[PDB]
Structure formats: C-alpha cells, structure tokens
Amino acid sequence: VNSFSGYLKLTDNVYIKNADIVEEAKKVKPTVVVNAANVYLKHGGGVAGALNKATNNAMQVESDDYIATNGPLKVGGSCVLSGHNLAKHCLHVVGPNVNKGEDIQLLKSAYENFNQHEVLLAPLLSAGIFGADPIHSLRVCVDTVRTNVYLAVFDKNLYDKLVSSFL
Ligand SMILES: Cc1nc(Cn2cnc(N)c3ncnc2-3)cs1
C-alpha cells in the first residue's frame, strides 16, 4: 500500500490523475517527484518553474551548484537532487524539447530513468511546452517504465482526452 489517492489504473504499474504535480507533491510528500527538466536545470516554466516556485527557489539554488560542479545533463538523462519541501528526492529528467529541435526518439531513454526508482510521482515527459504529443508520451511511459508511476496531468481537457484515447 502507498498514500496516492484518486488515480485511474491504466496498467499493472501506471496510474493517472487530473492534478497539478505541485499540489500532489505537497499532499503526498512522495519519495520521488519527477521534474520535467532541461539540461541546464533552469527551472523557468511548466513543471520546473512551478516546482521551483513551490520550493521558494531553493531547487534553483541547489541546481545551479549541481551544474557549476558537473556541467549540463544529456537530453534523455537525469540526476537525483533534493525534493526540498515537496518530496524526499527530485529526479530531474530531460525529455526532448520538440520546440528546440530535440529528437523525439530520446523520449524512451528519458522514461528509462524512472526504472531506477520503485515508486514515483511524475508528469508526462516532453508534454506541455516541450511540444510533444501527450498521447505519444503516455504510450512511451506505459511501454518503458516498469516501476510504479503515478502520473499527474494538470490540464483537465488533456486528462479527459488521454483517458478516452488510451489503448
Ligand atoms: C513541460 C511539461 N509540462 C507539463 C504540464 N504541467 C505543467 N504544469 C504543471 N504544474 C503540471 N503538473 C502536471 N503536469 C503539469 C508536463 S511536462
């Protein structure tokens, strides 16, 4: 048993809910929240800007020290940093940004990072302002992640579309 509530079950291991990932993290305090990061860990908008704002910018301060030491992530890569006030850990995962001309084939590599964690609260990678088709992102998630993933979709209209179209 875990503390996640109100999720639709898609598969053996994938669950989904219409909720802001920020509001879900505050309520659950999961072991791992996934950030939809970029390679610079510059948390401007989408899930990164919203998560970072909820940490009072502590996520960005920690992230800048990480980049100063290690350099940028790879597209498709990740790093584990603090979850601050939202979670034990934040897994910063870089999905391809379609709008940036980033290769969509890297989305599977991005979701493979989730398999290093038994349970995660996560957004749909490369969706929203990263420009990918969210229906595709959900399919790659279900076909790639083997650990237990609780997906938060903030947009009501997108949630209803993802559920109705899910095979
Ligand atoms: C770059 C990306 N944006 C989203 C959409 N999205 C944006 N803002 C939030 N606070 C969200 N919580 C859940 N999903 C959210 C997915 S990936």
Pocket of ligand 1 contains residue 21 by CB under 6 Å: yes
Q: Write the single-letter amino acid at 50.
A: A
Pocket of ligand 1 contains residue 47 by CB under 6 Å: yes
Q: How was this structure determined?
A: X-ray
Task: Give 98-144 as a DSSP string.
Answer: GGGT--TTHHHHHHHGGGGSSEEEE--TT-GGG---HHHHHHHHHHH
Which ligand 1 atom lies nearest to the CA of residue 152? Answer: 13
Q: In what order do the strands lie in the sheet with 89-93?
A: 8-9, 14-18, 148-153, 119-122, 32-36, 89-93, 78-82
Contact indicator for 78, 113 with CB cutoff of 8 Å = yes
Measure 21 CA to ligand 1 centroid, in angstroms. 7
Token pair for residue 85?
Answer: 């006030």
* Resolution of the experimental structure, in angstroms: 1.0
Radius of gyration of the chain (CA): 14
